[PDB]
Design an enzyme around this catalytic site. Structure first.
Site, PDB file in Angstrom:
ATOM      1  N   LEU A   1      60.171  47.703  40.592  1.00 54.37           N
ATOM      2  CA  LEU A   1      59.491  48.795  39.880  1.00 54.37           C
ATOM      3  C   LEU A   1      57.979  48.554  39.870  1.00 54.37           C
ATOM      4  O   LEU A   1      57.508  47.421  40.040  1.00 54.37           O
ATOM      5  CB  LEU A   1      59.996  48.886  38.429  1.00 54.37           C
TER       6      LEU A   1
ATOM      7  N   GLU B   1      57.937  47.487  27.276  1.00 54.42           N
ATOM      8  CA  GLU B   1      58.784  48.556  27.794  1.00 54.42           C
ATOM      9  C   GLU B   1      60.136  47.947  28.199  1.00 54.42           C
ATOM     10  O   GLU B   1      61.158  48.504  27.758  1.00 54.42           O
ATOM     11  CB  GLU B   1      58.167  49.428  28.887  1.00 54.42           C
TER      12      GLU B   1
HETATM   13  N1  LIG Z   1      62.255  52.685  36.764  1.00 55.94           N
HETATM   14  C1  LIG Z   1      63.546  52.478  36.520  1.00 55.94           C
HETATM   15  O1  LIG Z   1      64.056  52.646  35.436  1.00 55.94           O
HETATM   16  C2  LIG Z   1      64.450  52.003  37.615  1.00 55.94           C
HETATM   17  C3  LIG Z   1      65.946  51.772  37.256  1.00 55.94           C
HETATM   18  C4  LIG Z   1      66.709  51.287  38.442  1.00 55.94           C
HETATM   19  C5  LIG Z   1      66.153  51.110  39.614  1.00 55.94           C
HETATM   20  N2  LIG Z   1      64.781  51.351  39.849  1.00 55.94           N
HETATM   21  C6  LIG Z   1      64.307  51.067  41.272  1.00 55.94           C
HETATM   22  O2  LIG Z   1      65.061  51.871  42.230  1.00 55.94           O
HETATM   23  C7  LIG Z   1      65.179  51.041  43.459  1.00 55.94           C
HETATM   24  C8  LIG Z   1      66.692  50.729  43.607  1.00 55.94           C
HETATM   25  O3  LIG Z   1      67.166  52.008  43.966  1.00 55.94           O
HETATM   26  P1  LIG Z   1      67.959  52.501  45.248  1.00 55.94           P
HETATM   27  O4  LIG Z   1      68.208  53.895  45.232  1.00 55.94           O
HETATM   28  O5  LIG Z   1      67.265  52.048  46.445  1.00 55.94           O
HETATM   29  O6  LIG Z   1      69.343  51.722  45.173  1.00 55.94           O
HETATM   30  P2  LIG Z   1      70.523  51.478  44.206  1.00 55.94           P
HETATM   31  O7  LIG Z   1      71.263  52.620  43.728  1.00 55.94           O
HETATM   32  O8  LIG Z   1      70.027  50.430  43.230  1.00 55.94           O
HETATM   33  O9  LIG Z   1      71.392  50.512  45.285  1.00 55.94           O
HETATM   34  C9  LIG Z   1      71.764  51.217  46.543  1.00 55.94           C
HETATM   35  C10 LIG Z   1      73.133  50.561  46.845  1.00 55.94           C
HETATM   36  O10 LIG Z   1      73.892  50.702  45.872  1.00 55.94           O
HETATM   37  C11 LIG Z   1      75.221  51.155  46.202  1.00 55.94           C
HETATM   38  N3  LIG Z   1      75.609  52.428  45.634  1.00 55.94           N
HETATM   39  C12 LIG Z   1      74.835  53.204  44.833  1.00 55.94           C
HETATM   40  N4  LIG Z   1      75.423  54.303  44.428  1.00 55.94           N
HETATM   41  C13 LIG Z   1      76.722  54.134  45.056  1.00 55.94           C
HETATM   42  C14 LIG Z   1      78.029  54.980  45.073  1.00 55.94           C
HETATM   43  N5  LIG Z   1      78.102  56.141  44.406  1.00 55.94           N
HETATM   44  N6  LIG Z   1      79.036  54.520  45.763  1.00 55.94           N
HETATM   45  C15 LIG Z   1      78.858  53.347  46.383  1.00 55.94           C
HETATM   46  N7  LIG Z   1      77.826  52.551  46.457  1.00 55.94           N
HETATM   47  C16 LIG Z   1      76.777  53.019  45.748  1.00 55.94           C
HETATM   48  C17 LIG Z   1      75.239  51.067  47.746  1.00 55.94           C
HETATM   49  O11 LIG Z   1      75.522  49.733  48.038  1.00 55.94           O
HETATM   50  P3  LIG Z   1      76.048  48.782  49.401  1.00 55.94           P
HETATM   51  O12 LIG Z   1      74.951  49.032  50.359  1.00 55.94           O
HETATM   52  O13 LIG Z   1      76.317  47.493  48.798  1.00 55.94           O
HETATM   53  O14 LIG Z   1      77.287  49.628  49.689  1.00 55.94           O
HETATM   54  C18 LIG Z   1      73.784  51.474  48.029  1.00 55.94           C
HETATM   55  O15 LIG Z   1      73.183  50.745  49.189  1.00 55.94           O
HETATM   56  C19 LIG Z   1      64.289  49.778  43.269  1.00 55.94           C
HETATM   57  O16 LIG Z   1      62.915  50.075  43.624  1.00 55.94           O
HETATM   58  C20 LIG Z   1      64.445  49.598  41.730  1.00 55.94           C
HETATM   59  O17 LIG Z   1      63.389  48.864  41.245  1.00 55.94           O
HETATM   60  C21 LIG Z   1      63.916  51.795  38.816  1.00 55.94           C
HETATM   61  N1  LIG Z   2      63.582  51.843  30.271  1.00 52.70           N
HETATM   62  C1  LIG Z   2      63.799  51.155  31.353  1.00 52.70           C
HETATM   63  N2  LIG Z   2      62.873  50.296  31.830  1.00 52.70           N
HETATM   64  C2  LIG Z   2      63.102  49.618  32.932  1.00 52.70           C
HETATM   65  O1  LIG Z   2      62.169  48.841  33.386  1.00 52.70           O
HETATM   66  C3  LIG Z   2      64.354  49.737  33.663  1.00 52.70           C
HETATM   67  N3  LIG Z   2      64.593  49.032  34.804  1.00 52.70           N
HETATM   68  C4  LIG Z   2      65.769  49.178  35.364  1.00 52.70           C
HETATM   69  C5  LIG Z   2      66.043  48.389  36.625  1.00 52.70           C
HETATM   70  N4  LIG Z   2      65.272  47.189  36.823  1.00 52.70           N
HETATM   71  C6  LIG Z   2      65.298  46.102  35.985  1.00 52.70           C
HETATM   72  C7  LIG Z   2      64.458  44.999  36.264  1.00 52.70           C
HETATM   73  C8  LIG Z   2      64.428  43.874  35.462  1.00 52.70           C
HETATM   74  C9  LIG Z   2      65.240  43.771  34.330  1.00 52.70           C
HETATM   75  C10 LIG Z   2      65.222  42.599  33.438  1.00 52.70           C
HETATM   76  O2  LIG Z   2      64.874  41.453  33.777  1.00 52.70           O
HETATM   77  N5  LIG Z   2      65.512  42.771  32.141  1.00 52.70           N
HETATM   78  C11 LIG Z   2      65.707  41.685  31.193  1.00 52.70           C
HETATM   79  C12 LIG Z   2      64.508  41.375  30.304  1.00 52.70           C
HETATM   80  C13 LIG Z   2      63.591  40.593  31.178  1.00 52.70           C
HETATM   81  C14 LIG Z   2      62.367  40.241  30.453  1.00 52.70           C
HETATM   82  O3  LIG Z   2      62.370  39.917  29.159  1.00 52.70           O
HETATM   83  O4  LIG Z   2      61.172  40.256  31.018  1.00 52.70           O
HETATM   84  C15 LIG Z   2      66.900  41.936  30.265  1.00 52.70           C
HETATM   85  O5  LIG Z   2      67.287  40.812  29.787  1.00 52.70           O
HETATM   86  O6  LIG Z   2      67.160  43.171  30.215  1.00 52.70           O
HETATM   87  C16 LIG Z   2      66.072  44.851  34.064  1.00 52.70           C
HETATM   88  C17 LIG Z   2      66.110  45.990  34.866  1.00 52.70           C
HETATM   89  C18 LIG Z   2      66.689  50.039  34.837  1.00 52.70           C
HETATM   90  N6  LIG Z   2      66.486  50.787  33.740  1.00 52.70           N
HETATM   91  C19 LIG Z   2      65.296  50.615  33.150  1.00 52.70           C
HETATM   92  N7  LIG Z   2      65.005  51.314  32.029  1.00 52.70           N
END
Ligand SMILES: NC(=O)c1ccc[n+]([C@@H]2O[C@H](COP(=O)([O-])OP(=O)(O)OC[C@H]3O[C@@H](n4cnc5c(N)ncnc54)[C@H](OP(=O)(O)O)[C@@H]3O)[C@@H](O)[C@H]2O)c1
Ligand SMILES: Nc1nc(=O)c2nc(CNc3ccc(C(=O)N[C@@H](CCC(=O)O)C(=O)O)cc3)cnc2[nH]1
Length: 206
Positions: free
Chosen positions: A25, A32
């Protein structure tokens, strides 16, 4: 049976719905991420006894979690992976899909288990979020809106805050955000490291 309980999605996104950059991220927000942790791990004082929450995440999000921090502690972790290439862990599950994941928990954490399941959260990423968004049991979105158009390469799949989804998704009062999360939470904008953000709760009728 397959799914009895409601699902909750948790995300931190920009106003453009950007959620990640380079399998990571794109920001560093300690307070947060602290919020993510207390939301995803809070169970009532009485239910505090048996109950643990569950976090469902896609493979890539799994990998994107700092080695030091995973598996995410005090929660049942499950990775969704079609390939199931490596499904490592000392007590952490794997599953082919969201539905498969629901059934493994019901099976694993039935009556023959000390520790019972409280709340189930989908924590991403974009592919898993797309699947949850189409699930008949997802009725709530815990979102953090970041008021900064930060460069991302991964986006939230549905513009739930847009006018087109306004008859379906509704933003709830802060007071009931706090009651659901069970702790008081900061109202309005929050500044941390140059970014302005806010906590919201959206719900839809099943
Ligand atoms: N800001 C936030 O709150 C937040 C929260 C989460 C993630 N993120 C970000 O989003 C990115 C990760 O996202 P992403 O879209 O690339 O991947 P993702 O959903 O985390 O992982 C993709 C993998 O997950 C599996 N998958 C997901 N949905 C599936 C389904 N319905 N059925 C089967 N397999 C499924 C597949 O795995 P296999 O390839 O193993 O089959 C696919 O390659 C990172 O940059 C992460 O930091 C941000
Ligand atoms: N509100 C929100 N913020 C996020 O950053 C977030 N991130 C994800 C996916 N990515 C991540 C990345 C790191 C950790 C993680 O290390 N969390 C720890 C706390 C770590 C720390 O104290 O710095 C945990 O124990 O949840 C969780 C989710 C999914 N939903 C979210 N939702």
């Amino acid at each position: 049976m397959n799914q009895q309980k409601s699902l909750t999605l948790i995300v931190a996104l920009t106003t453009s719905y950007g959620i990640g950059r380079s399998n990571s991220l794109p920001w560093k927000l300690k307070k947060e991420i602290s919020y993510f942790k207390r939301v995803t791990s809070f169970v009532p004082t009485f239910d505090s006894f048996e109950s643990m929450n569950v976090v469902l995440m896609g493979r890539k999000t799994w990998e994107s979690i700092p080695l030091q921090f995973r598996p995410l502690k005090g929660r049942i972790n499950v990775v969704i992976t079609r390939n199931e290439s490596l499904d490592l862990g000392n007590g952490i599950h794997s599953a082919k899909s969201l539905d498969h994941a629901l059934e493994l928990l019901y099976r694993t954490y039935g009556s023959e288990s000390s520790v019972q399941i409280n709340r189930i959260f989908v924590i991403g990423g974009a592919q898993l979020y797309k699947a949850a968004m189409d699930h008949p049991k997802l009725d709530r979105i815990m979102a953090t809106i970041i008021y900064k158009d930060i460069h991302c390469d991964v986006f939230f799949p549905l513009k739930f805050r847009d006018k087109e989804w306004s008859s379906v998704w509704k933003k709830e009062k802060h007071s009931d955000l706090e009651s659901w999360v069970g702790t008081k939470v900061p109202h309005g904008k929050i500044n941390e490291d140059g970014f302005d953000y806010e906590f919201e709760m959206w719900t839809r009728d099943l």
